[PDB]
């Protein structure tokens, strides 16, 4: 086929910049229970998910895939994508996670919910890392789209791998442009992709706690129950 796999590295960056969803606000007001906080996160996330679906469709190559593969990739990738997104926008708020512009959590608001703090720190560690490398908006969106394409690829083939090679070239185009020597381009790419494992790890953990929360019982959205029931 085409047609993705015929984009310049510069117009690939642009397609992805153009598709970026907006940063959504929280419904937030009112002191915090575990219930209030968790109904807030699930309201926000539910709405973020709808943008993510639409955003996925603008990831060049995604829409060539079969609807059922689209469903699988999104069902694997969803909470990684939200995490990477949280991490990235929390980047200039050391110690703090910017869930929404009007919902910035500090370490110790994390403790309302069981085992949320541990994840909290994991995201903080990641945020710190992005900062310490100075992740760039354009690198970020390649990463975000690697997640989507990679997360559920080995739990299914060759169209996905061509696109991925395209995203890597793109990532490398970026670093060649920032004037990094070849050696530090290969090192940077490595450092960026290793972070993806930490993102998988956190998603996996957040997922199991989401599962235990649904038992504990805030009501989850229908879209959110479905996304979650895919990992059970």
């Amino acid at each position: 086929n085409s047609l993705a796999l015929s984009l310049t590295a510069d117009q690939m960056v642009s397609a992805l910049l153009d598709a970026e969803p907006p940063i959504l606000y929280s419904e937030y007001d009112r002191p915090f229970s575990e219930a209030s906080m968790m109904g807030l996160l699930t309201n926000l996330a539910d709405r973020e998910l709808v943008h993510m679906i639409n955003w996925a469709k603008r990831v060049p190559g995604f829409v060539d895939l079969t609807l059922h593969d689209q469903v699988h990739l999104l069902e694997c990738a969803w909470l990684e994508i939200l995490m990477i997104g949280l991490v990235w926008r929390s980047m200039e708020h050391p110690g703090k996670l910017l869930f929404a512009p009007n919902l910035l959590l500090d370490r110790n608001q994390g403790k309302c919910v069981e085992g949320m703090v541990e994840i909290f720190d994991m995201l903080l560690a990641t945020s710190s890392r992005f900062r310490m490398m100075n992740l760039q908006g354009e690198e970020f969106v390649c990463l975000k789209s690697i997640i989507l394409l990679n997360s559920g690829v080995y739990t299914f083939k060759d169209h996905i791998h061509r696109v991925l090679d395209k995203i890597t070239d793109t990532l490398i185009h970026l670093m060649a442009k920032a004037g990094l020597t070849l050696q530090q381009q290969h090192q940077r790419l490595a450092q960026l992709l290793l972070i993806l494992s930490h993102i998988r790890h956190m998603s996996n953990k957040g997922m199991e706690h989401l599962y235990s929360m649904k038992c504990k019982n805030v009501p989850l959205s229908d879209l959110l129950l479905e996304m979650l029931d895919a990992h059970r």
Partner: peptide, 10 residues
């Protein structure tokens, strides 16, 4: 008919 299905179709 997952809700995800509909959103991806439209």
């Amino acid at each position: 008919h997952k809700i995800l299905h509909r959103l991806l179709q439209d």
